[PDB]
Design a protein around this motif. Sequence first.
Motif, PDB file in Angstrom:
ATOM      1  N   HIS A  27     -37.131  26.748 -29.917  1.00  0.00           N
ATOM      2  CA  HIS A  27     -35.989  26.757 -30.507  1.00  0.00           C
ATOM      3  C   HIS A  27     -34.859  26.539 -29.562  1.00  0.00           C
ATOM      4  O   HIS A  27     -35.072  26.524 -28.282  1.00  0.00           O
ATOM      5  N   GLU A  28     -33.618  26.661 -29.830  1.00  0.00           N
ATOM      6  CA  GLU A  28     -32.272  26.701 -29.006  1.00  0.00           C
ATOM      7  C   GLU A  28     -31.410  27.432 -29.406  1.00  0.00           C
ATOM      8  O   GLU A  28     -31.318  28.488 -30.604  1.00  0.00           O
ATOM      9  N   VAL A  29     -30.434  27.878 -28.471  1.00  0.00           N
ATOM     10  CA  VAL A  29     -29.393  28.859 -28.889  1.00  0.00           C
ATOM     11  C   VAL A  29     -27.797  28.062 -28.870  1.00  0.00           C
ATOM     12  O   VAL A  29     -27.127  28.727 -29.528  1.00  0.00           O
ATOM     13  N   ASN A  30     -27.641  26.983 -28.140  1.00  0.00           N
ATOM     14  CA  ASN A  30     -26.854  26.279 -28.235  1.00  0.00           C
ATOM     15  C   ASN A  30     -25.143  27.076 -28.229  1.00  0.00           C
ATOM     16  O   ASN A  30     -24.817  27.123 -29.445  1.00  0.00           O
ATOM     17  N   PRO A  31     -24.818  27.335 -27.263  1.00  0.00           N
ATOM     18  CA  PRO A  31     -23.683  28.593 -27.327  1.00  0.00           C
ATOM     19  C   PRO A  31     -22.519  27.923 -27.951  1.00  0.00           C
ATOM     20  O   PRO A  31     -21.192  28.470 -27.945  1.00  0.00           O
ATOM     21  N   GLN A  32     -22.432  26.629 -28.014  1.00  0.00           N
ATOM     22  CA  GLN A  32     -21.243  25.895 -28.810  1.00  0.00           C
ATOM     23  C   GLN A  32     -20.826  26.208 -30.195  1.00  0.00           C
ATOM     24  O   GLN A  32     -19.733  25.826 -30.719  1.00  0.00           O
ATOM     25  N   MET A  33     -21.954  26.682 -30.875  1.00  0.00           N
ATOM     26  CA  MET A  33     -21.891  26.709 -32.320  1.00  0.00           C
ATOM     27  C   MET A  33     -21.897  28.280 -32.653  1.00  0.00           C
ATOM     28  O   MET A  33     -21.809  28.595 -33.817  1.00  0.00           O
ATOM     29  N   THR A  34     -21.143  29.152 -31.923  1.00  0.00           N
ATOM     30  CA  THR A  34     -20.939  30.468 -32.142  1.00  0.00           C
ATOM     31  C   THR A  34     -19.438  30.778 -32.425  1.00  0.00           C
ATOM     32  O   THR A  34     -19.063  31.871 -32.643  1.00  0.00           O
ATOM     33  N   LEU A  35     -18.538  29.930 -32.248  1.00  0.00           N
ATOM     34  CA  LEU A  35     -17.057  30.083 -32.618  1.00  0.00           C
ATOM     35  C   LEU A  35     -16.926  30.210 -34.180  1.00  0.00           C
ATOM     36  O   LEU A  35     -16.128  31.074 -34.604  1.00  0.00           O
ATOM     37  N   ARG A  36     -17.505  29.361 -34.980  1.00  0.00           N
ATOM     38  CA  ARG A  36     -17.498  29.415 -36.647  1.00  0.00           C
ATOM     39  C   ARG A  36     -18.053  30.675 -36.940  1.00  0.00           C
ATOM     40  O   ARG A  36     -19.230  31.136 -36.281  1.00  0.00           O
ATOM     41  N   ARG A  37     -17.636  31.422 -37.942  1.00  0.00           N
ATOM     42  CA  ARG A  37     -18.085  32.739 -38.558  1.00  0.00           C
ATOM     43  C   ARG A  37     -19.416  32.030 -39.148  1.00  0.00           C
ATOM     44  O   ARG A  37     -19.598  31.275 -39.913  1.00  0.00           O
ATOM     45  N   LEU A  38     -20.298  33.476 -39.128  1.00  0.00           N
ATOM     46  CA  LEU A  38     -21.374  33.452 -39.900  1.00  0.00           C
ATOM     47  C   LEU A  38     -21.178  33.694 -41.314  1.00  0.00           C
ATOM     48  O   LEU A  38     -20.089  33.930 -41.621  1.00  0.00           O
ATOM     49  N   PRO A  39     -22.351  33.328 -42.174  1.00  0.00           N
ATOM     50  CA  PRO A  39     -22.156  33.753 -43.527  1.00  0.00           C
ATOM     51  C   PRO A  39     -21.837  35.230 -43.898  1.00  0.00           C
ATOM     52  O   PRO A  39     -21.409  35.768 -44.693  1.00  0.00           O
TER      53      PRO A  39
END
Lengths: 49, 49
Positions: free
Chosen positions: B33-45
């Motif tokens: 799997h991946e964590v890719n810290p660049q996609m944590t800006l957008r809010r989760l559901p």
Amino acid sequence: MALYVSPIVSGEVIRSRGGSTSEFTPGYVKPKHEVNPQMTLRRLPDEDP
Amino acid sequence: MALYVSPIVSGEVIRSRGGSTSEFTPGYVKPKHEVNPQMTLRRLPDEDP
């Protein structure tokens, strides 16, 4: 049984009872089996390698 | 069986037992799997606005 002897004749005399014997003598059993001293060189199915 | 050997004919010798195997290596599995810290800006559901 008894059947019916009348009170004028002596009647018959009964054979009392008994008599039966038998014999069951010998019997035997003996399971000899070998240890195979040359069988211990190779690995048994047990005894993890 | 060891049926009925008479005690002057001492008797016969038996062969005991043994033998079985199987082979199968390990198998394997690995779900990367991946964590890719660049996609944590957008809010989760979750995390109400």
